[PDB]
């Protein structure tokens, strides 16, 4: 057999991110001990990422490409800190914020940059305050103990509802993955011959083998549904 397209993404020659026109890494300023006001100089769109970024100035002018909540405008004053009040814009630690509210770009570790809840039209919800660890629900469903000192932007991330509209033409998806990375178009494994992929070969196109494989299964062998505790139509539940 040959090495399979799933294995070949590691070696990373043509399968690298197209990172040329990307404006910078989206994160907070570092922590550095109250309250600090910060004007939104402008809000710009970087390629690949569906969200906007908003370039702040903590005037020297110290810059920070923070990811943009919805309802931010140019020449708003954003207020990072503990004793900053509640507006959509402001960047509070999880000690201060009320529970049962939608927050954006929340950090895992303090002073980190921002980790959970970054893509367009997403938000971490806050469940409740234990003592040190403010428990929050992530967009998927999963729940996470996160320390109260670490920061999070208030409100929902901008650019919501982009997949509501379908892309009618193959050309629209060509321009989508030009900004991101080469991973498209996908040739299906059944169509390929036996050497190229596991599902390939045979007189008539069909999978033949069970098509559902363990965590223990090797490189080359992990193809199709990996460790699928259910399959088929998820009716109810």
């Amino acid at each position: 057999g040959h090495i399979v397209r799933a294995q070949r993404r590691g070696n990373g020659s043509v399968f690298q991110a197209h990172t040329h026109h990307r404006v910078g890494p989206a994160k907070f300023r570092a922590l550095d001990a109250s309250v600090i006001s910060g004007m939104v100089k402008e809000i710009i769109h970087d390629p690949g990422r569906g969200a906007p970024l908003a370039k702040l100035i903590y005037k020297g002018f110290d810059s920070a490409l923070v990811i943009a909540p919805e309802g931010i405008h140019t020449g708003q004053f954003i207020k990072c800190g503990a004793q900053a009040d509640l507006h959509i814009g402001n960047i509070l630690p999880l000690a201060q914020i009320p529970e049962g509210t939608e927050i954006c770009n929340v950090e895992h570790r303090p002073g980190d940059g921002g980790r959970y809840g970054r893509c367009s039209g997403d938000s971490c919800r806050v469940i409740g305050h234990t003592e040190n660890y403010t428990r929050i629900q992530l967009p998927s469903g999963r729940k996470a103990l996160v320390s109260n000192i670490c920061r999070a932007t208030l409100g929902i991330v901008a650019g919501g509802g982009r997949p509501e509209k379908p892309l009618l033409k193959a050309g629209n998806v060509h321009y989508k993955y030009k900004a991101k990375r080469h991973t498209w178009p996908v040739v299906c494994g059944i169509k390929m011959n036996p050497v190229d992929h596991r599902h390939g070969g045979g007189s008539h196109q069909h999978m033949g083998a069970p098509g559902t494989v363990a965590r223990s299964a090797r490189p080359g062998q992990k193809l199709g549904l990996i460790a699928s505790r259910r399959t088929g139509r998820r009716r109810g539940t």
Binding site: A68, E70, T74
Partner: protein, 89 residues
């Protein structure tokens, strides 16, 4: 004269792509081109610049909105949530 009976903005696509998809995009393509009322300078000339971004021309300003309308319903709910908690206490 009106010249298409049914189709509207999706007449550019012609016979392609199915009836159900052109109904769906008819709603969204009308939205993203439409000029919307500005908060700041007041005037009705807020166009879409990029995906999330909505530049007003005459202001010279921008706002972060939705993808295809400047107001997302879910983001508009978040204002009302932080209003009632700030107005309390």
């Amino acid at each position: 004269a009106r010249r298409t009976k049914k189709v509207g903005i999706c007449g550019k696509y012609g016979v392609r792509y199915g009836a159900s998809l052109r109904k769906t995009i008819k709603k969204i393509e009308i939205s993203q081109r439409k000029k919307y009322p500005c908060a700041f300078c007041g005037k009705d000339s807020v166009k879409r610049n990029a995906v999330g971004i909505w530049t007003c021309t005459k202001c010279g300003k921008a706002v972060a909105g939705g993808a295809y309308t400047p107001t997302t319903p879910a983001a508009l709910t978040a204002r009302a949530a932080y209003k009632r908690i700030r107005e309390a206490q």
